[PDB]
From TrEMBL:
Name of the gene: sbsC
Domain BIG2: 442-518, 524-613, 627-677
Keywords: Calcium, Metal-binding, Signal, Zinc
Repeat recorded as keyword: no
Shown part of the complete sequence: 31 to 774 of 1099
GO molecular function annotation: identical protein binding; metal ion binding
Protein name: Surface layer protein
Record flagged with keyword Signal: yes
Protein species of origin: Geobacillus stearothermophilus ATCC 12980
Domain of life (superkingdom): Bacteria
Residues reported to bind Ca(2+) 3: 656, 677
Length: 710
C-alpha cells in the first residue's frame, strides 16, 4: 500500500486502464463509452501519475530514475503528451476527437435546421464553419489510436456531416459569386464580374430545391446590374459615300462630345491623315455621320480612332480603333417605290426611288440623283404635289445613264393604311398585369396610380410613314367584343368589371386590328405563413415570430390579423401595429406560468395555429454573445433558455478600424459596429468572448476546447 513498488504498479495499471475504458468498448461492443466515464478515468490517471512521481522522488535511490522514466513512458503514451505522434496521448486525443465529432453532428443538425427553414444567410455561415471543421480540424480525428475507433467516429459523426456539406457546394458557390459580382461593379472592376457571372451561370442549373427560388433571383440580379453598369462602346464604322462615314455606338452618345476634335481618321498602314469637317448625330444617339474634307479612295480601308467621347448622362467611352472599307457602288437600275406620291409642298423625291446594282441588291447610299419633273424643282430634289392629280418625274443617277425614264405618278393624299401598334397603356407605360379592381402593373411589376387607363394606337399611311396629328375617338375609334368582361369607350378608356378575357378592336375607317386583353381575378388571401415552427420561451421573457400574408399568385397581400392565446394564465400574446396596416407582422409572446398552450393566428377566413410552451427556467449558467452591425449579450440557463439580458453593463474594447458605442431604444440596449480587427467583450474585469470584424461583417469567436494544440 505505502511501499513505492505497489504505488508504481497501480499507477501504471490505472493509466492503461483509462485507455482500455474506450478501446475495449469499441472493440468488444462496437459502441462508444460514456464520455463522462472517459473523463473520470482520464482525471484519475493524471492524479495516479502525479502521486506516483511524488512518491518515487520521496524515496530516492537507484530505482528512482528507473521508476520515473517508466511511469513517464506510460503517461505520455496512454494518457497525455503535448504534440503527440500517432500512438501517444491516447485518452487525451480520444477525448478531443469525440468532442470534435459530436460538435460536427450538432453543426450538421444546425445546418439542416436552416436548410428546412430555407434560411440562406444562416446556412452559408454554418456551411463555412463546418467546411473549415471538415478540412482543417480533421487532424484531431487522425490522432486517435485505434482503427476501429477512428472509423466509428467517421461513420457515426463525419459521414453525414460531409454528405450534407457536399450536396450544398453549388448553392453556396452561386450565393458567393453573385455577391462577388455585385461587389465588383460597385468597386468598378468589370473583369471580376464577368469571371464571377460565368461561374454563376454554370452552377445555377445544379442547385438544390432548398434555395432554388432565392438563388435564381440572386443570379439574375447580378446579371441585371452588370448589363446596366457596363462601359459604352463604339460598335462599328461604315462608309456612306466618298466623303462621309457612319459610326454606331452601343449606348446613346452625348452631343457635346460628338465633335470633329474627337475623331481621328487615317488611311490604314500610312500616316496620311483625313480631317473631319462635321459630326451629325441621330435623334436617338446610337448613330453618327462624320463628314470629311478629303475624298475616300475606292477599295481602301480607313482607321477611325475615337477619343474623349461620353454617354448620355453617363460615363466615358473606351478609346477605340475601328476600321471601314470604302467601296463605291455601281448603280444599274432605278425604280419608284410606288405608282403614287403624297400631297405636299416639298416632296423629297430621293425618298421615293430605290437604286439597285446589276445583281439586284439595293444601294442605300453612295450615288447622287438628278431629277427632272413636270413640276418645278427646289434644291434639285423637292417638288410641290399640292392640288395635283398626277406628275411626271424622271430620276437619273448623276454620272450614269441609269434612269427611271419619264414616269407618271398619281398624287394621293396621305390616309391610314396599317395599324403600326395597339397596346393597353396607363400613364404612357405599357401594362402587362391588370386586375378587375382596376390596378395595372407594368413590365416588371410596379403599379402606377397617376394616368388614366386607355388604349394607344399609332398608324402608318400607304407610303409607310407614321400618321401624325390624329385624335382618338374622332379619326379612329376603339370597341369591345366582350362588354361584360371589359368596357371600352370610343377614345379607348377602360373600366373592367369581371375577370376573364375580352377582345379589343380599333378602327380607322376600313383599317382595323384586334388585340386580346386578359383581366385577372382580384387579389385574395391564400396563405398565412409563419416564421417559427414552435415557440419556447422562459417565464417572464419575450419571443418573436414573423407572420407573412400571401395572395394566390405569391405576392404581399395587405390585410388585418388578430392573434389570440388559448390561456392567458400560461402565455400572453400581442401583434405589431395593432393588427392593422402591413402585410408582414411580428408577434410577441410573453411567458406567465410553466406548461403548454397553442396560439391562433386568424385572418378573415383562414387561420394557422402555432405551438407555444413556456418553461420556468433555472438560474444563469452561461452568457451568449449574439450577432443578430448590432450586437447583444444574453444571460442563459443550463437548458439554453434565454433568461435575462446584459447587453448593458457589458463593455467592449480592443489607427482604429471600428467605432463601438452603447445604444438604447425604449429599454432594449444594443451595441453598434461602425467604421473609421478583434474586439473584446467584458463584464467588469472578466472577459466574456472576442468578436472578429472585417472590411462590415462580424462573427463571435468560439473558444479553443482542445486538450492538444495544433
Amino acid at each position: 500500500a505505502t511501499d513505492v513498488a505497489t504505488v508504481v504498479s497501480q499507477a501504471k495499471a490505472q493509466m492503461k486502464e483509462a485507455y482500455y475504458t474506450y478501446s475495449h468498448t469499441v472493440t468488444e461492443t462496437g459502441q462508444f463509452p460514456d464520455i463522462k466515464d472517459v473523463y473520470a478515468a482520464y482525471n484519475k490517471a493524471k492524479q495516479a501519475y502525479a502521486n506516483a512521481v511524488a512518491v518515487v522522488n520521496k524515496a530516492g535511490g537507484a530505482k528512482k530514475d528507473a521508476y520515473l522514466a517508466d511511469l513517464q513512458a506510460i503517461y505520455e503514451t496512454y494518457v497525455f503528451k503535448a504534440n503527440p505522434k500517432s500512438g501517444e496521448a491516447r485518452v487525451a486525443t480520444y477525448i478531443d476527437a469525440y468532442n470534435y465529432a459530436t460538435k460536427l453532428d450538432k453543426m450538421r443538425q444546425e445546418l439542416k435546421a436552416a436548410v428546412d427553414a430555407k434560411d440562406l444567410k444562416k446556412a452559408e455561415e454554418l456551411y463555412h464553419k463546418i467546411s473549415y471543421e471538415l478540412k482543417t480540424r480533421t487532424v484531431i480525428l487522425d490522432r486517435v489510436y485505434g482503427q476501429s475507433t477512428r472509423e466509428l467516429l467517421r461513420s457515426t459523426f463525419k459521414a453525414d456531416a460531409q454528405a450534407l456539406r457536399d450536396r450544398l457546394i453549388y448553392d453556396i458557390t452561386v450565393a458567393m459569386k453573385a455577391r462577388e459580382a455585385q461587389d465588383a461593379v460597385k468597386a468598378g472592376n468589370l473583369d471580376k464580374a464577368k469571371a464571377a457571372l460565368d461561374q454563376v451561370n454554370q452552377y445555377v442549373s445544379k442547385v438544390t430545391d432548398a434555395f432554388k427560388a432565392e438563388l435564381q433571383k440572386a443570379a439574375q440580379d447580378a446579371k441585371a446590374a452588370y448589363e446596366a453598369a457596363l462601359t459604352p462602346k463604339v460598335e462599328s464604322v461604315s462608309a456612306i459615300d466618298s466623303t462621309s462615314f457612319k459610326v454606331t455606338f452601343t449606348k446613346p452618345v452625348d452631343k457635346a462630345t460628338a465633335i470633329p476634335k474627337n475623331f481621328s481618321i487615317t488611311l490604314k498602314g500610312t500616316e496620311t491623315k483625313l480631317y473631319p469637317k462635321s459630326v451629325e448625330v441621330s435623334e436617338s444617339g446610337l448613330t453618327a455621320t462624320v463628314t470629311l474634307y478629303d475624298t475616300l479612295v475606292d477599295g481602301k480601308t480607313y482607321t477611325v480612332v475615337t477619343s474623349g467621347l461620353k454617354d448620355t448622362a453617363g460615363k466615358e467611352f473606351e478609346t477605340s480603333t475601328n476600321e471601314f472599307t470604302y467601296n463605291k457602288p455601281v448603280p444599274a437600275s432605278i425604280t419608284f417605290n410606288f405608282n403614287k406620291l403624297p400631297e405636299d409642298s416639298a416632296v423629297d423625291l430621293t425618298k421615293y426611288v430605290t437604286v439597285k446594282d446589276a445583281a439586284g441588291n439595293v444601294i442605300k447610299s453612295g450615288f447622287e440623283l438628278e431629277f427632272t419633273s413636270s413640276e418645278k424643282l427646289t434644291q434639285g430634289k423637292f417638288i410641290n404635289t399640292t392640288g395635283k392629280k398626277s406628275v411626271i418625274v424622271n430620276a437619273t443617277v448623276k454620272g450614269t445613264n441609269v434612269t427611271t425614264g419619264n414616269v407618271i405618278l398619281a398624287v394621293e393624299d396621305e390616309k391610314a393604311a396599317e395599324v403600326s401598334e395597339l397596346k393597353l397603356t396607363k400613364d404612357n407605360k405599357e401594362v402587362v398585369t391588370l386586375y378587375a379592381n382596376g390596378n395595372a402593373f407594368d413590365k416588371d411589376g410596379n403599379q402606377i396610380s397617376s394616368g388614366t387607363l386607355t388604349l394607344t394606337a399609332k398608324f402608318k399611311d400607304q407610303y409607310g410613314n407614321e400618321l401624325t396629328g390624329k385624335v382618338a375617338g374622332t379619326d379612329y375609334t376603339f370597341e369591345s367584343l366582350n362588354p361584360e368582361v371589359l368596357v371600352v369607350a370610343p377614345d379607348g378608356s377602360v373600366t373592367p368589371i369581371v375577370p376573364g378575357t375580352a377582345l379589343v378592336k380599333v378602327k380607322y375607317g376600313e383599317v382595323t386590328k384586334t388585340i386580346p386583353v386578359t383581366v385577372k381575378a382580384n387579389p385574395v388571401l391564400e396563405t398565412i405563413a409563419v416564421d417559427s415552427t414552435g415557440v419556447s420561451v422562459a417565464k417572464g421573457q419575450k419571443a418573436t415570430f414573423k407572420v407573412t400574408l400571401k395572395d394566390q399568385y405569391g405576392n404581399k397581400f395587405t390585410g388585418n390579423v388578430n392573434v389570440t392565446s388559448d390561456k392567458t394564465e400560461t402565455a400572453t400574446v400581442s401583434v405589431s401595429n395593432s393588427g392593422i396596416g402591413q402585410s408582414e407582422y411580428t408577434v410577441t409572446v410573453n411567458g406567465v406560468a410553466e406548461g403548454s398552450t397553442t396560439i391562433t393566428i386568424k385572418s378573415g377566413t383562414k387561420e394557422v395555429k402555432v405551438p407555444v410552451n413556456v418553461v420556468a427556467g433555472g438560474p444563469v449558467a452561461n452568457y451568449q454573445i449574439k450577432v443578430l452591425v448590432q450586437l447583444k449579450v444574453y444571460a442563459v440557463d443550463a437548458n439554453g433558455n434565454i433568461v435575462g439580458d446584459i447587453t448593458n453593463d457589458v463593455t467592449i474594447t480592443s489607427g482604429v478600424i471600428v467605432n463601438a458605442s452603447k445604444s438604447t431604444a425604449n429599454g432594449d440596449t444594443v451595441y453598434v459596429i461602425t467604421d473609421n480587427e478583434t474586439l473584446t467583450v467584458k463584464l467588469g474585469t472578466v472577459t466574456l468572448g472576442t468578436v472578429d470584424v472585417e472590411v462590415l461583417k462580424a462573427t463571435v469567436v468560439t473558444k479553443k476546447a482542445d486538450l492538444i494544440e495544433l
